[PDB]
Subunit: 394 residues, 5 copies
Amino acid sequence: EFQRKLYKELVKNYNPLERPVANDSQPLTVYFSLSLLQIMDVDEKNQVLTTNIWLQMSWTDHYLQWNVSEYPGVKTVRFPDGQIWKPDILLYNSADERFDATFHTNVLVNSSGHCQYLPPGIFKSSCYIDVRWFPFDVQHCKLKFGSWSYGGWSLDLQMQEADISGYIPNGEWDLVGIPGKRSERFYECCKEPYPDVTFTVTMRRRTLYYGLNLLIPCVLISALALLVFLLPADSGEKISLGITVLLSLTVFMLLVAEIMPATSDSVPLIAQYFASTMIIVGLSVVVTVIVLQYHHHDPDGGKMPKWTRVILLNWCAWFLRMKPDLAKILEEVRYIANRFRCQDESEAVCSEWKFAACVVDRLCLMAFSVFTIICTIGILMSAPNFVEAVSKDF
Amino acid sequence: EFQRKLYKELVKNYNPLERPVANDSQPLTVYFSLSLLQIMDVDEKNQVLTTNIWLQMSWTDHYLQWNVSEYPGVKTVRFPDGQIWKPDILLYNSADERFDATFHTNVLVNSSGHCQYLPPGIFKSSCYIDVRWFPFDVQHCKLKFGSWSYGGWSLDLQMQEADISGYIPNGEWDLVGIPGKRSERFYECCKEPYPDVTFTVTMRRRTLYYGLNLLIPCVLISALALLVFLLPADSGEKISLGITVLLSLTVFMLLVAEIMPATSDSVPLIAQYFASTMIIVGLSVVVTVIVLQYHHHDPDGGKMPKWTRVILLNWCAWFLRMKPDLAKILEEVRYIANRFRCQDESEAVCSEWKFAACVVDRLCLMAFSVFTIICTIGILMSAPNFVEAVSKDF
Amino acid sequence: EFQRKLYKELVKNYNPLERPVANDSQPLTVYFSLSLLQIMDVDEKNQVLTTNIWLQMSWTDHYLQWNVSEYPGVKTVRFPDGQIWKPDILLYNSADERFDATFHTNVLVNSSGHCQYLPPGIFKSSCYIDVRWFPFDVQHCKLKFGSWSYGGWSLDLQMQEADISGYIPNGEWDLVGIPGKRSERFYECCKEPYPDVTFTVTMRRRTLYYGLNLLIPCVLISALALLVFLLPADSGEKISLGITVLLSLTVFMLLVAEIMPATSDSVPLIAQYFASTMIIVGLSVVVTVIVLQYHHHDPDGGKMPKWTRVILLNWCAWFLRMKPDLAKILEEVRYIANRFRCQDESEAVCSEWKFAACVVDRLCLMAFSVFTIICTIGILMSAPNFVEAVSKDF
Amino acid sequence: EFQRKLYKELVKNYNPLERPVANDSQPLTVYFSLSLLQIMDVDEKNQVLTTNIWLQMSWTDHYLQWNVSEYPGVKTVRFPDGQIWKPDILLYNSADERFDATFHTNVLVNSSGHCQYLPPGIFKSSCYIDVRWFPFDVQHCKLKFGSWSYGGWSLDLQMQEADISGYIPNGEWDLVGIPGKRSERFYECCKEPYPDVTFTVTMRRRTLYYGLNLLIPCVLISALALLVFLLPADSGEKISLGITVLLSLTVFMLLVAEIMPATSDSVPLIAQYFASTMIIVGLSVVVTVIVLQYHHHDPDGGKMPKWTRVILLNWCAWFLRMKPDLAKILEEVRYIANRFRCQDESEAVCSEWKFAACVVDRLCLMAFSVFTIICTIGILMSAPNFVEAVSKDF
Amino acid sequence: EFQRKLYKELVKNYNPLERPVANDSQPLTVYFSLSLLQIMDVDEKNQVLTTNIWLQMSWTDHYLQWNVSEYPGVKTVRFPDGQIWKPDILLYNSADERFDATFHTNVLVNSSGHCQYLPPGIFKSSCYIDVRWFPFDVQHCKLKFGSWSYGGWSLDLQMQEADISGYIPNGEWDLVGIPGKRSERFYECCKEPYPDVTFTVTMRRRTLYYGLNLLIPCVLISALALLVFLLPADSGEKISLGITVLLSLTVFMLLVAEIMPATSDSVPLIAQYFASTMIIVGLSVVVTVIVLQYHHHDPDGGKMPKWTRVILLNWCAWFLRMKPDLAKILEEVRYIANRFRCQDESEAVCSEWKFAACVVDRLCLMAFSVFTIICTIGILMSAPNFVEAVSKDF
Ligand SMILES: *[C@@H]1O[C@H](CO)[C@@H](O)[C@H](O)[C@H]1NC(C)=O
Ligand SMILES: [Ca+2]
Ligand SMILES: [Ca+2]
Ligand SMILES: [Ca+2]
Ligand SMILES: [Ca+2]
Ligand SMILES: [Ca+2]
């Protein structure tokens, strides 16, 4: 009976259009905060953050007060959308096609006029997602909230610290924090300033998944490329090993292509690693052609230059620790024996060329191994967060 | 005439804003339950569960009572959304972009004021989907329901057991159960506690599909890799077999990549199996290079070390059960015969090196076969539910 | 003037909440049917059917009658949603996120109160799609309609045969029929029974597309695998042909993976066909290694077992219809001649081993050809609808 | 003042439910047309057409007239949805999930009651998309509009020619025309006939994109297959070239698979072209095995049949324009010389077999080249629109 | 008290249907502009631009004025959708399925009747996206705004310069400008003209991402194809290198296929580059077959033509800087010696053919290298914006 009586009394002459202050000249203080429940998605290609949040707004309605003695037991009332004045706070940097994903719930008012409003929502927000250091990256995505049509002279927006006590951890992203800042900005539309409250979600990517699924795979497959410098040339499979690894790594680059944005602010760390690896595998194919060209050198073609004979067979090789009818019969048998001698000297020349190929193959093995290690270590450890990622995730 | 009369009488002074109790100081008891019709989707990558459910709410409306003698034949009435007070129960962990997928239906009230409300819905809910043991996994996805704006002092939410009599089986997921728990929790917003009813859908994945399409394929293709240790070196195809298997298995890992979340809570079982298999195939390629390096060893290069001569040709080989013008003519023919003898001894040296390659090839065949079996069996049987899956699905 | 007068008269005291019967104690008869215009989609992976349907409901409104003499020319009126009582019939097994895809249109009433209501819709429904016999499958998808909040005591739902006179043929699915059944079921919610009308869309898949794009391709590529048993061993390409076919067929399995659900109710027909084919190609690779192992057998290694010498060179081969200074000179020339004789006998031994490989290769060619035909024919003709599909589609 | 006065006067007793005619017995004439702005999408796989259209409806409202002398300057008024009677014209063959994509705009009425209504929309419509001649195809997609609840006795729908003056050309589709037809049809629901206006969008596909990206690529890669019949057998790469082309073309078929519907009304032109090409490449692999089988024929095996010796070495080859101690020493040297003679005759036999392989290789080169040209030209020129496509697009 | 009083006074007799002018004969001036916050997406395949914009409309409402002395402190009021007259300005070339993505916010009115309205939105617009010069392209996408139902005689639309002070840079697109133009156009619907304001977003694509991920990769992989002309023929791997590169580049074309529209207005720059490269790699395979055909030429077949002997061994080779019992014994040994001589001359003939292959291989290396450079440089530098892209992005 008292709840029915109070609801009838409170809506007498109430105008939801009217900002509920007693003195029309002063601004209404609105306290704004949020409660972050979940980070649902970090879409790097579209540059969008999806979160489950509960907005928190609280203010004082001058007209919605009563004396609890005259209504025993009725400490609070509730009003749905449209029957009560509410602040029109929107997320400025919204990426949602409706632009406002807020699910409108009740406003809870107590007997002194304090109004609480806690609409939930699945919010899509635009934030610059920097992939320069991917996958060892930290993202800072802003959520900028503010009254759309009330400037600082009418609505005095005030900030309170974000609530994370209900945050559900994300298996991919490690929540570092969510600080907030209250600013007052001027826009070209209007002489009046408009205040905003901006919360910056700082998140660290967890690198175990990409380490075991992207980085390590690539390292191992690059190592197989260097295996060509150990395969004997007579196997006749040197070129198949190298080009096969190359074809495999090309598909791998395109696999990373599906997850990275097509921006030009910087060459990402992962792009550099794949680049460096690809030229190394490609260069090994070039070297293999050179090695095969020696191993198959015609013994009756040009003559091994002195510069080759010295650099390879001596220096590099040492450094690598390698190292009447009787007369007619005599003319026929002598021709046979002489023919055997000529091929023997010819094949000796071929042995030198084959040995040169082996030396070049051993030389490039050492050089490519060093270069692969240096490029890999250098690129990965360039990231500021690489040491932290190893400690926390591995 | 009586139905028209009763509808006119019941809405006289009715206020949908008003919680329908007689004594404003006491809370209204709302009985909440659900009826699970279908598990529509388990999205492991986005971590979302889609279900077809019928919510069940029932309470007592103090104002919607009548005397059936005064309205003969009118035992029940119905009211749509907005003409009657309803509890504002939402799914807290909703992943739906509207945040509330409930389809609003009628409230059915009988002559004593008992109100029933059974809205259907396609619900999207957020739940941690653990892929540690995939595909032998059991998921526990929670659905947390509660009044949004009425605390424990006004709405007394009470739980009833979930209904599954209409459940339609899912070909992928075996419904284990759906127990419920009623809790009362405090939030930072409000001093008043808020009760919730949470139902935990426990589901077991059916492994036949992934066994025949993911696990067995991989096992067979790994076995082909070990086939290299039986292929003679003179075939000149040892490296093509191995690297081809490797390229195939790389695509297979990326196929599993499209279905798994990118989380770092644990290395999944399937990831370990693919890892172990990949290094085994990759290591077999390394061994093949060593085997070919012996088979193609130059007979005029270094000399077979004693350590090699003993470990391989004796121990390993036993264990494996392998095992004036006349004078001028004499000088020419003697050179020819001597030349033949020199190559003969040379090719004998080559035979030892070729035999060493065969022994190493046989040795690694046994070692790799053992390792492949142990790694496969060990990884699969680590899962707690592996034995159950085999019994129920195979 | 009369149309305006009649609309004013009919809405006097009309209450859309009120079931429009004269006697409140008796149920209102609602005739329900549907008109199927198109089968838009059969999603086997998500297990959802999309159709374009026109629902048909008809009943009698006791209050919406008039005397056409008093309103000359006004034979009918129309009312939109909310101004007239309507049955609240929903599709129970809806897969749509709004749960109700009905587009609300007018209710057409004639001068005796007969009301017709024919809302169109794009309906998404859940149905078990059995892929056991895919692509030779017949699907039975149910559409279950019923009043949500009116039980059998108030709304007497009655069925009429579905209309297909406007059905537009689907190029993929051959509509077999759409019979309907009216049932009355009890639910745990309520003591009152609720009637439903269920229409079962029975559709036959047209197999021409999958025959020419999925089945025949696979058959031809498997045949190329058997081609290895005709390729001479000295070509040095036996292993490349086989493993290449294997890599190709693995991609083909994953292509079928994108269209099939991940259920475990049964191993599909297409899965069995790919399985059988894959082991046959894989087994041919194993046999190729054995054949090469003979063709490259060292003549100075073990000795051809008697069991081999008899089974192959005799039985299998027949069945297959294969089949002072002068003395010093004498010692040098005799050594040369003797050396030639030793290699000659050695290469004769090699010829036997090479012939054994040829016999084994011919033997397995016949065996694999038989097995490929039997497995292919057996699997395809296991389907109950295989004969029908060939007759109608090919 | 006059605009305010007129709006107050016109809505006095206006009933949006009432069809605005003076004589209730006669039908209201509604003129229907459309303005086609853009063809947005032609989805062949889902069989849906997406367009940007402006509907045009015009009729006479008997009640919304005024005397412009009594309201100087007020020549027109406007009414939004729900305040004015409108025809309920829908697109019958809609594929949109809401079923009605019309964006509701104002109705513009002049002082004599003529009402204009031009709602814009993004319309999704179902049309049979025939891919028999793809990519040289012409599509005829219908858009069928009609009043949903007003039959021919109440609403007299009349057609006017479609407007294309604002049409924006589509880079893929060449708009041929959009004629319209007005029909009157009977439905099983109702004895009254219902008129419809149907516009048929006829569009020609532009073939430059598919010619350079789909047809020509395939032609060139098939040509490489025939290159095998020029590669010498001793290269040992004949089988790798052929099977590699085959693997490439299999992926290409699956690429076309992603864009074509899975219907069985006909085998498309593109499917036939890929079919023909695939068997040609596959058959070339079979021939390569035969050629290699001759080139590697054992000289001590069977004897070259007479039928082979004549058909190939003579006919085909001509047509192709190819073409005491002294005695002991004598026995040893005679054995050596005799041994040399035996191999010489043996290798002569091998030369004939190698030449036969060359002849067969040359023969099949000519045959396969002819067949490839004929099949390609025949298939492409079977399309009725092939000549037109070349003239307009190339 | 004054805010409540003013809201009550202003809505007395207010009619939102009425255009708020004092003199009904004159048009109402509406100032239109926009504020561009973000370019969210440029979808080249669907030809759609997605942006985050704030529309700006301002006009004068003759009825919403008051004297601020009579309402101290009340300088402004606000009205939501439907309680105030607003211009019905839509985006004409909308690609959104609702056709109007505007989020409706408040209208802010001051004491002299000046009304401001700044609705935000995520706008999808249709624009021709020219890919002729992709990835060095500049796009000009139009956004055409205008009143839908008010012509130039009633609503006088006037333009103001677009605001970009809040523009957030896009990592892919460099905003060049957003000029606007106000036009007045006649349509077939209506004799009255309708004015529009069109803003043209001009954007330059940033080429770093595609340069490092699309252009450079392709250049390097084409270079590997030319590596075949350095690989010795005896390696037996010439054909595997070439066809492998070809298979890789085919996948690369299909990767670009997923991002380009299927239009026929022009052959894109990227298509030409891939075309040119593909024929070069394919032609190198053809040349390799010719080179191998010489290297494996039978010495007893045809005779090297004079035209070949001169062009290659002399001209091209110079330009390239290449270059009683005793008698019986005599007959046996003489046969042996003569046999050795015959093979010697035979292998000399083979050496010439092998050298010819080497010369042809060297010749084509130079020719293909030149052609690859010219085609690459020519195609890339054909783009008008190529020089600008290098300067700004590299
Ligand atoms: C506004 O009101 C003040 C106080 O009543 C009065 O002095 C002033 O003249 C008014 N201005 C007008 C009527 O323009
Ligand atoms: Ca992420
Ligand atoms: Ca699942
Ligand atoms: Ca289907
Ligand atoms: Ca198309
Ligand atoms: Ca873009």
